[PDB]
Amino acid sequence: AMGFNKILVVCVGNICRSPTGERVLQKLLPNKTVASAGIAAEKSRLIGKPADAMAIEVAKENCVDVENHQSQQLTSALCSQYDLILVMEKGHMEALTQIAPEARGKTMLFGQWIGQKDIPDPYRQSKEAFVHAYQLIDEAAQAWAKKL
Ligand SMILES: [Cl-]
């Protein structure tokens, strides 16, 4: 009914949380187009980095494919192509507003339907941190799927 067909999942690096969230939500909603971007996307010179090796490993154990990901920079042009934008932290909303002020009105929280929780960043931590990040992303995505 809302027409949220193209969904953009956003974090800072676009290598841990947002590619995980993108692929978990994509598996739950096969007829939707789910992509991801970073407020300060991690790049190798100018090439988009793949998802963190541990993020790929943890998702693989939960039957979610996070291979063939290339990080991309969040821009106003990119935001204009999506119907719904889902940030990983409430704090990300201020930075997103500076890049894409026209995206105000379609920027929502990834963990909105799980008590408005921020998804913990597992970057540079052990496998267990990647497990907890995945588990909370899964709970949040399942709650979004019932509303989409
Ligand atoms: Cl991040």
Automatic annotation (TrEMBL):
Q: Which residues form the active site?
A: 11, 17, 121
Q: For this UniProt entry, which segments traverse the membrane?
A: none
What sequence ranges are listed for the domain Phosphotyrosine protein phosphatase I?
Answer: 5-147
CDD domains tied to this protein: LMWPTP
The yes or no answer to whether the keyword rRNA processing is present is no
What residue range is the signal peptide?
none
E.C. number: 3.1.3.48
Q: Which InterPro entries match?
A: LMW_PTPase, Ptyr_pPase, Ptyr_pPase_sf, Tyr_phospatase_low_mol_wt
Q: What is the official name of this protein in its record? A: protein-tyrosine-phosphatase
